[PDB]
Amino acid sequence: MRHYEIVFMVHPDQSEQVPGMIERYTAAITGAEGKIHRLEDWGRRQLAYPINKLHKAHYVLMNVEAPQEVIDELETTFRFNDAVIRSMVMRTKHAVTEAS
Amino acid sequence: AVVKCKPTSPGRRHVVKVVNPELHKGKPFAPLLEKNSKSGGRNNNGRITTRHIGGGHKQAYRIVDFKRNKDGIPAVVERLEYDPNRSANIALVLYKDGERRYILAPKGLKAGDQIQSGVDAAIKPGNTLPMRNIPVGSTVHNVEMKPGKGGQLARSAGTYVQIVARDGAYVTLRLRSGEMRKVEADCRATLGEVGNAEHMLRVLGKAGAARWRGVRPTVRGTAMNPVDHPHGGGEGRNFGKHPVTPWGVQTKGKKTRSNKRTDKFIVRRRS
Amino acid sequence: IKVRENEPFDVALRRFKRSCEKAGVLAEVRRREFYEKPTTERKRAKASAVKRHAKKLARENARRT
Amino acid sequence: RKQVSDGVAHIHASFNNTIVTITDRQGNALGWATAGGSGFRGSRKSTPFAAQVAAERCADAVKEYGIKNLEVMVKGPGPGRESTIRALNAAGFRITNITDVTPIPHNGCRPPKKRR
Amino acid sequence: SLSTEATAKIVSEFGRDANDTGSTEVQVALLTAQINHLQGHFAEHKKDHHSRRGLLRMVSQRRKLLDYLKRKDVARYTQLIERLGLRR
Amino acid sequence: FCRFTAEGVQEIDYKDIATLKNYITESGKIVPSRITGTRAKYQRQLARAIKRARYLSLLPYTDRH
RNA sequence: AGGAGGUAAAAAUGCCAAG
RNA sequence: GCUUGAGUCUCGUAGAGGGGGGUAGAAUUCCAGGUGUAGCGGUGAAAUGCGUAGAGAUCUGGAGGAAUACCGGUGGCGAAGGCGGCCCCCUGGACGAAGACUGACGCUCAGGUGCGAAAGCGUGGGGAGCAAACAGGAUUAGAUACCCUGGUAGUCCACGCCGUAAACGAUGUCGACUUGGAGGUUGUGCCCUUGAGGCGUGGCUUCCGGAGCUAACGCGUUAAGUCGACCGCCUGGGGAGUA
């Protein structure tokens, strides 16, 4: 499996339903042999430019290791979830377990 | 799949058939057909109201589910099928309780695909949702205009409607014409675009190829005598009138829409 | 770009836009794509740069200053 | 009148002409004056001096608002810039901050071919 | 492509042992596994002209090795091409 | 003249906004390698780091936002 | 040392002459 | 038979190499609205054009298409044409270290086949910005031009076609050999990494220059030097790359 580095930011009005969103996503990962190597929640921090006339989005960090198709429905989960206002995926050369 | 047929005859030379090998080569499903007699363009008074409608091939009507209101039950596309009443193809679907129905065929659809209506249906082509649940920006077809009425927009082949915005109670749709229309957000729509998208790439080739499709020859206005048309007459191919219909209203650019009833729902006209 | 310095203003002294552009990106995209004249005007810009670097390392003759 | 105290001065220093528009903080315009309006039709409006009299002719177009604090937003390549700000400082306005809002694309639109 | 365990499967089937990795029977089989794998890549994209040049290099290098093998040992050659389905 | 992760070894990560702030200017543009003396390998690395950090709004694209 | 400019930086027209 | 040529495997590294799909911000234009007042725009100077039906300026909201500022570098990659936002999926090649393996499998290549900028062509889309044609205004002896205001094809996408270019380092491919210097870039070994160092060793690349060569200019270990293998081509200018 490839390692990925999912970062997604959440609408501030759904910042309270952030940790409920996490174990929904881990069960998709861990339910298909996906090991998780970070979860570091960055809380709400102020955006450097207004996204959809919002500021202070809620940042999440993942650093998981899954097969290719397993994160593919996770990416389509992000497109139709209207509480996440953007999300980027990165990849391997390691599985990293560190801080900011 | 468009195929340019080889010119072994005049009238066979310019034929491009669009042939789909996935259509069910067989008889259609029996309990979803009733008869559909032609009219020839004549109404109760028996007079030809719309011209150039004529013979054909005695085609039978197929009951197509346009409401798609059997909700929460999955359905499996049994086979695609040919339909002589549309430009699109139809797909005979089988619900889990044994009910068979005809629906329009979206683009990426084949036998074995699983579809579902209702609110909780997934975002996949063929699925039917109320438009307050479809994400804005999506590409839908078979769109209603009043909730529960049916499906009335984007039904022909290759046609689709893009959802542009959503003001809470209403949904703006960019229609295939280019007209941005408003519609109630509780109306259903089927995802994806309608299949058979290369229907426009066919050419008939023959005069008779149109003639067995139902149409009749359209004799031009300027060939008639002046008692028959507002054009017409002239010793030797004249024309000196502004072009009009046979009933004498301007035909090259004259806006005939006058409704004032559903004018509230049109954000921008076709351009 | 943005300038305050907040107390003792007294004078503009905007080297700040000159430290980023002040004309240099604006008197460039004023017109004229060219699409290949950059590739030749960058080349002579580098060619004159390395030739004067060869010149300043070749000044020591006498010239009687 | 509304009599607002703090305002924004926009300066559209193009190559041919300069436009000095004084607005409020929100952006609603209060008064303006250009180099072409001050006379100087032709080559004279493309000079720094015509920018200077355009700013002065805009300062007494907002005397009825009593603006005392101006933040300057200069925009453009023209010779207006470093002379039309000095005319606002001599006009009796307190320059709170200067910034250039010169619209620079992040490389896309094809510019014209012009002027052989 | 042709990941590391997939080449390990081929190099043990055709060679004398696992470190025997350069023999003609191994190389011909190893190219054929990659050539057959890339058929699905070009049944798709079809305009990857830069990657198809690497495919034709693998085709022509396979043909040169078989033409080497048919000259040296025609017994192993006929045993090889039936073992992968070649020689149109 | 000085150096970077050629000695303080790194494989630049975009989430280190403290270190990345040193390598943009006040208008948010990336400062060139001729200024900071960064090796050309790492200047490519932090260019991708800044371009990713601009996407996540951890760094601004301009100052005029 | 390279970079940027600077009341400034250009660009109005300006053909022909025979062994 | 042999191992140096050629090739395979293991392990890493760099990259605008290609194809597909997403998405991001800056700007232009348009649309709507607020404010607001007579100009704006343009030029050598003008006018056409736009503007009291309220433009330009400014602010908010939207819709679109196209291109990717800064990084950015005689930097990188690709057989060449070429390839620059970011992210994923699929995929090619190169190079290095240390070993193992095959055992001359090689080099070149007429005909053949494939790729091949831009313009163009076909069908279907799309169309912001530019812009052939075209129109108006200038300039001028004239101005079918340069300049200005507009502006269609096109530029963009998909799929076919065309098969050309100052397609150029105007230098065919492959191999060997023959003083140096300063760089760039990308690997790697060793030593005190003690610290950005020191010592080596590979790949690619830019500039200067020695012998030599050249008609000269110049080329100069990436040769146009000294040689070998194979291919393409030339034989006065015009007519003519035409019939």
Short mmCIF file of C-alpha atoms (C1' of nucleotides) in Angstrom, two decimals, chain H residues 1-225:
data_model
loop_
_atom_site.label_atom_id
_atom_site.label_comp_id
_atom_site.label_asym_id
_atom_site.label_seq_id
_atom_site.Cartn_x
_atom_site.Cartn_y
_atom_site.Cartn_z
"C1'" G H 1 34.89 -20.92 -25.38
"C1'" C H 2 36.24 -16.00 -22.84
"C1'" U H 3 34.96 -11.19 -20.88
"C1'" U H 4 35.97 -5.65 -21.79
"C1'" G H 5 31.12 -4.45 -26.27
"C1'" A H 6 25.81 -5.00 -25.73
"C1'" G H 7 22.02 -6.56 -22.26
"C1'" U H 8 19.24 -8.34 -17.35
"C1'" C H 9 18.41 -8.13 -11.97
"C1'" U H 10 18.86 -5.80 -6.97
"C1'" C H 11 19.01 -0.49 -4.46
"C1'" G H 12 18.40 4.57 -4.79
"C1'" U H 13 18.36 9.60 -7.00
"C1'" A H 14 16.90 13.92 -10.04
"C1'" G H 15 13.39 15.80 -13.88
"C1'" A H 16 8.22 21.74 -17.42
"C1'" G H 17 9.23 13.28 -20.36
"C1'" G H 18 4.17 11.62 -21.94
"C1'" G H 19 -1.44 10.39 -21.31
"C1'" G H 20 -5.84 10.90 -18.16
"C1'" G H 21 -8.80 13.28 -14.24
"C1'" G H 22 -9.39 16.95 -10.52
"C1'" U H 23 -8.62 21.69 -8.30
"C1'" A H 24 -6.32 26.68 -6.95
"C1'" G H 25 -5.38 31.90 -6.93
"C1'" A H 26 -4.19 36.66 -9.85
"C1'" A H 27 -6.04 39.37 -13.94
"C1'" U H 28 -9.03 40.69 -18.48
"C1'" U H 29 -14.06 40.89 -20.38
"C1'" C H 30 -19.21 40.56 -19.58
"C1'" C H 31 -23.66 40.74 -16.41
"C1'" A H 32 -26.33 42.98 -12.14
"C1'" G H 33 -26.38 46.58 -8.28
"C1'" G H 34 -24.60 50.65 -4.90
"C1'" U H 35 -21.84 55.31 -4.90
"C1'" G H 36 -20.71 59.29 -8.09
"C1'" U H 37 -19.78 63.13 -11.95
"C1'" A H 38 -18.38 64.94 -16.83
"C1'" G H 39 -15.59 63.17 -19.45
"C1'" C H 40 -13.15 58.57 -20.86
"C1'" G H 41 -10.18 56.15 -24.33
"C1'" G H 42 -6.31 56.85 -27.73
"C1'" U H 43 -1.99 59.07 -30.19
"C1'" G H 44 3.93 62.09 -32.62
"C1'" A H 45 -0.49 64.83 -32.52
"C1'" A H 46 -5.44 63.57 -33.73
"C1'" A H 47 -10.01 61.51 -34.95
"C1'" U H 48 -13.12 57.16 -35.26
"C1'" G H 49 -15.15 54.92 -30.63
"C1'" C H 50 -17.47 55.12 -25.62
"C1'" G H 51 -20.31 58.86 -22.24
"C1'" U H 52 -25.86 62.92 -19.24
"C1'" A H 53 -30.16 56.85 -21.85
"C1'" G H 54 -25.18 58.56 -16.95
"C1'" A H 55 -19.53 56.14 -18.95
"C1'" G H 56 -14.64 56.14 -17.12
"C1'" A H 57 -13.22 55.75 -11.67
"C1'" U H 58 -14.71 52.89 -7.11
"C1'" C H 59 -17.25 48.83 -4.32
"C1'" U H 60 -20.13 44.32 -3.79
"C1'" G H 61 -22.16 39.95 -6.11
"C1'" G H 62 -22.11 36.61 -10.28
"C1'" A H 63 -21.12 33.94 -15.03
"C1'" G H 64 -17.40 32.38 -18.26
"C1'" G H 65 -13.07 31.08 -21.05
"C1'" A H 66 -7.87 30.98 -21.45
"C1'" A H 67 -3.02 31.21 -19.53
"C1'" U H 68 -0.01 29.78 -15.38
"C1'" A H 69 3.33 35.88 -12.25
"C1'" C H 70 7.15 35.13 -8.25
"C1'" C H 71 10.25 30.54 -8.20
"C1'" G H 72 13.23 30.61 -13.17
"C1'" G H 73 18.61 29.78 -13.78
"C1'" U H 74 23.79 29.60 -21.62
"C1'" G H 75 18.67 25.45 -15.03
"C1'" G H 76 16.08 20.44 -16.16
"C1'" C H 77 13.80 16.55 -19.16
"C1'" G H 78 12.80 14.45 -24.09
"C1'" A H 79 14.95 10.87 -30.41
"C1'" A H 80 13.58 15.34 -32.50
"C1'" G H 81 9.13 18.51 -32.71
"C1'" G H 82 8.82 20.08 -27.76
"C1'" C H 83 7.53 20.26 -22.42
"C1'" G H 84 6.33 25.34 -16.75
"C1'" G H 85 0.43 26.49 -10.99
"C1'" C H 86 -0.81 22.46 -7.64
"C1'" C H 87 -2.68 17.27 -6.59
"C1'" C H 88 -3.77 12.14 -7.84
"C1'" C H 89 -3.93 7.79 -11.35
"C1'" C H 90 -1.42 5.27 -15.50
"C1'" U H 91 3.42 5.24 -17.92
"C1'" G H 92 8.46 5.87 -20.70
"C1'" G H 93 13.61 6.95 -20.49
"C1'" A H 94 18.21 8.41 -18.17
"C1'" C H 95 21.98 8.08 -14.31
"C1'" G H 96 24.62 6.13 -9.87
"C1'" A H 97 26.61 2.56 -6.05
"C1'" A H 98 27.90 -2.50 -4.97
"C1'" G H 99 27.48 -7.30 -6.67
"C1'" A H 100 25.36 -11.25 -9.43
"C1'" C H 101 23.91 -13.16 -14.41
"C1'" U H 102 23.72 -13.86 -20.08
"C1'" G H 103 28.06 -14.57 -23.33
"C1'" A H 104 29.45 -10.84 -29.19
"C1'" C H 105 23.30 -11.20 -28.45
"C1'" G H 106 26.80 -5.70 -31.72
"C1'" C H 107 27.09 -1.00 -35.14
"C1'" U H 108 24.80 1.18 -39.41
"C1'" C H 109 20.56 1.05 -42.52
"C1'" A H 110 18.20 1.78 -49.08
"C1'" G H 111 13.11 0.42 -49.43
"C1'" G H 112 9.35 0.17 -45.01
"C1'" U H 113 6.97 1.91 -40.64
"C1'" G H 114 6.15 5.49 -36.73
"C1'" C H 115 6.61 10.37 -34.50
"C1'" G H 116 6.65 15.41 -36.25
"C1'" A H 117 6.15 23.43 -34.34
"C1'" A H 118 2.88 26.76 -36.46
"C1'" A H 119 -0.54 27.75 -40.16
"C1'" G H 120 -4.34 25.02 -42.55
"C1'" C H 121 -8.52 21.20 -43.44
"C1'" G H 122 -13.02 17.84 -41.69
"C1'" U H 123 -16.96 16.90 -38.03
"C1'" G H 124 -18.84 18.29 -33.09
"C1'" G H 125 -18.10 21.59 -29.10
"C1'" G H 126 -16.36 26.17 -26.87
"C1'" G H 127 -15.27 31.38 -27.36
"C1'" A H 128 -12.77 35.59 -22.04
"C1'" G H 129 -8.30 37.77 -24.25
"C1'" C H 130 -5.68 38.46 -28.59
"C1'" A H 131 -6.46 38.66 -33.81
"C1'" A H 132 -5.58 37.25 -40.55
"C1'" A H 133 -9.80 38.98 -43.48
"C1'" C H 134 -12.86 43.24 -43.09
"C1'" A H 135 -14.66 48.23 -41.54
"C1'" G H 136 -13.85 53.14 -39.75
"C1'" G H 137 -10.28 56.98 -38.29
"C1'" A H 138 -5.41 58.96 -39.26
"C1'" U H 139 -0.72 59.57 -41.74
"C1'" U H 140 0.72 60.41 -46.80
"C1'" A H 141 1.77 62.88 -53.38
"C1'" G H 142 -0.86 58.16 -52.85
"C1'" A H 143 -1.14 54.36 -48.13
"C1'" U H 144 -5.13 48.38 -50.47
"C1'" A H 145 0.60 49.57 -45.02
"C1'" C H 146 3.11 50.85 -40.47
"C1'" C H 147 -0.40 53.86 -36.05
"C1'" C H 148 -5.59 54.06 -33.69
"C1'" U H 149 -10.82 52.21 -32.69
"C1'" G H 150 -13.54 47.95 -33.55
"C1'" G H 151 -13.65 43.00 -35.36
"C1'" U H 152 -14.97 37.35 -38.08
"C1'" A H 153 -11.92 32.86 -39.17
"C1'" G H 154 -8.38 31.18 -36.02
"C1'" U H 155 -6.10 30.71 -31.31
"C1'" C H 156 -8.94 26.39 -26.92
"C1'" C H 157 -11.25 20.95 -26.53
"C1'" A H 158 -12.33 16.01 -28.65
"C1'" C H 159 -11.37 12.86 -32.91
"C1'" G H 160 -9.40 12.41 -37.77
"C1'" C H 161 -6.14 14.76 -41.73
"C1'" C H 162 -1.88 17.53 -43.45
"C1'" G H 163 3.66 16.12 -43.07
"C1'" U H 164 6.00 21.10 -43.98
"C1'" A H 165 9.96 25.19 -41.00
"C1'" A H 166 16.15 29.41 -40.70
"C1'" A H 167 12.34 21.41 -38.19
"C1'" C H 168 19.39 25.07 -36.98
"C1'" G H 169 24.57 23.42 -32.62
"C1'" A H 170 22.64 25.66 -40.95
"C1'" U H 171 27.45 20.26 -38.07
"C1'" G H 172 24.11 11.90 -39.79
"C1'" U H 173 24.63 7.84 -36.37
"C1'" C H 174 28.33 4.65 -33.52
"C1'" G H 175 33.23 3.64 -31.46
"C1'" A H 176 38.34 4.71 -30.16
"C1'" C H 177 42.38 8.12 -29.28
"C1'" U H 178 44.67 13.16 -28.32
"C1'" U H 179 47.43 19.36 -23.45
"C1'" G H 180 44.28 22.65 -20.09
"C1'" G H 181 41.27 26.43 -17.24
"C1'" A H 182 36.76 28.46 -14.98
"C1'" G H 183 31.67 27.18 -14.12
"C1'" G H 184 26.50 25.03 -13.81
"C1'" U H 185 23.76 20.69 -12.60
"C1'" U H 186 22.96 15.71 -10.76
"C1'" G H 187 24.96 11.00 -8.25
"C1'" U H 188 28.48 8.65 -5.11
"C1'" G H 189 33.12 7.00 -2.22
"C1'" C H 190 36.63 8.09 1.72
"C1'" C H 191 38.49 11.05 5.86
"C1'" C H 192 38.52 14.52 11.55
"C1'" U H 193 30.36 15.41 9.58
"C1'" U H 194 34.47 17.36 13.85
"C1'" G H 195 31.18 23.21 10.88
"C1'" A H 196 29.03 25.51 5.67
"C1'" G H 197 34.87 21.58 4.80
"C1'" G H 198 39.06 17.99 2.68
"C1'" C H 199 40.02 14.25 -0.83
"C1'" G H 200 38.20 11.40 -4.82
"C1'" U H 201 35.10 9.26 -8.73
"C1'" G H 202 30.61 8.99 -12.47
"C1'" G H 203 26.52 11.33 -15.91
"C1'" C H 204 24.84 15.70 -18.38
"C1'" U H 205 25.95 20.77 -19.50
"C1'" U H 206 27.97 26.35 -20.45
"C1'" C H 207 32.21 29.36 -21.53
"C1'" C H 208 37.44 30.36 -22.70
"C1'" G H 209 41.58 28.38 -24.93
"C1'" G H 210 46.63 24.77 -26.50
"C1'" A H 211 48.39 21.45 -30.28
"C1'" G H 212 46.11 20.31 -34.65
"C1'" C H 213 42.70 21.52 -38.52
"C1'" U H 214 40.43 25.26 -41.64
"C1'" A H 215 39.91 29.53 -47.54
"C1'" A H 216 39.28 32.45 -43.45
"C1'" C H 217 35.83 33.20 -39.68
"C1'" G H 218 36.42 29.90 -36.33
"C1'" C H 219 36.14 24.56 -34.13
"C1'" G H 220 38.91 23.06 -30.18
"C1'" U H 221 38.06 15.78 -25.26
"C1'" U H 222 30.28 17.63 -26.30
"C1'" A H 223 36.04 18.76 -32.55
"C1'" A H 224 35.09 21.25 -37.68
"C1'" G H 225 41.73 17.23 -34.37
#
